Design a protein around this ligand. Structure first.
Ligand SMILES: [Ca+2]
Length: 279
């Protein structure tokens, strides 16, 4: 399939070179998989989700996304226009409030909640989680990531946005999950993206057009935005039978576009998520 004049980052994870605007992908498009966006929620009523999104948990007085961050991330995962896995089922877990913040213990609760809830959902092709959030190193927050992964969810986490080594941030530093740095449409590392040997992969993170609340769409930037490209890609690959939730971070690394980013420090992978669909 092909979706012309696509946001640059969808084109980019289906291209070997930068500077193209069509997204080439297999039409199964993540059918039969499930992605949990653990964030500020999802405006499920957005036309762009087409009935494929459901809040299923909020730790606040309301489950609605009143911030837009979660809605944006979820759109990159699985909205019809702006998404990677255009036919996956989305599930929202509101751990962050509407200013986008949230206490560690609420975040850990939401994570353990996915390890369990997945057993209340039909996700025969695989289950992913996407965590576009992070704060300073915590053994506990990391351990909640690891539990989620161990239970058989592909966990994708933002590496952070301070320009540092991500080894000091959580859940980014945790080893056993898939820590996602950011890039721009000219294959530069995004100027805010964290780096460091704990990263597994880069995806598109600078000027990422996706959904917003009110039914609306904006471009924003962040490792938040890079993270749901890798989650959605993991869903797409599960569905195609290429990989599994426990194997998907390694499969994505193995099949990435290797050398191609500039602005990589020494010691950080130079790997760019690729769907290996057009070539
Ligand atoms: Ca890993």
């Amino acid at each position: 399939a092909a979706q012309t004049n696509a946001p640059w980052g969808l084109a980019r994870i289906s291209s070997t070179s930068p500077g193209t605007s069509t997204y080439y992908y297999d039409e199964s498009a993540g059918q039969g998989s499930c992605v949990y966006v653990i964030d500020t929620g999802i405006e499920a009523s957005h036309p762009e989700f087409e009935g494929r999104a459901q809040m299923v948990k909020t730790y606040y007085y309301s489950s609605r996304d009143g911030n837009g961050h979660g809605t944006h991330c979820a759109g990159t995962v699985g909205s019809r226009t702006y998404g990677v896995a255009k036919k996956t089922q989305l599930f929202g877990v509101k751990v962050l409030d509407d200013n986008g913040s949230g206490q560690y213990s609420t975040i850990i609760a939401g994570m353990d909640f996915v390890a369990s809830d997945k057993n209340n959902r039909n996700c025969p092709k695989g289950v992913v989680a996407s965590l576009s959030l992070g704060g300073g190193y915590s053994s506990s927050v990391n351990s909640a990531a690891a539990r989620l992964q161990s239970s058989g969810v592909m966990v994708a986490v933002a590496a952070g946005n301070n320009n540092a080594d991500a080894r000091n941030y959580s859940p980014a530093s945790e080893p056993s999950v898939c820590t996602v740095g950011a890039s721009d449409r000219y294959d530069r590392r995004s100027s805010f993206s964290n780096y460091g040997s704990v990263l597994d992969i880069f995806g598109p993170g600078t000027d990422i057009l996706s959904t917003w609340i009110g039914g609306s769409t904006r471009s924003i930037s962040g490792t938040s935005m890079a993270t749901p490209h890798v989650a959605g890609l993991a869903a797409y690959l599960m569905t195609l039978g290429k990989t599994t939730a426990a194997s998907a971070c390694r499969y994505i690394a193995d099949t990435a576009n290797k050398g191609d980013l500039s602005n990589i420090p020494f010691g950080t992978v130079n790997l760019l998520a690729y769907n290996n669909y057009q070539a």
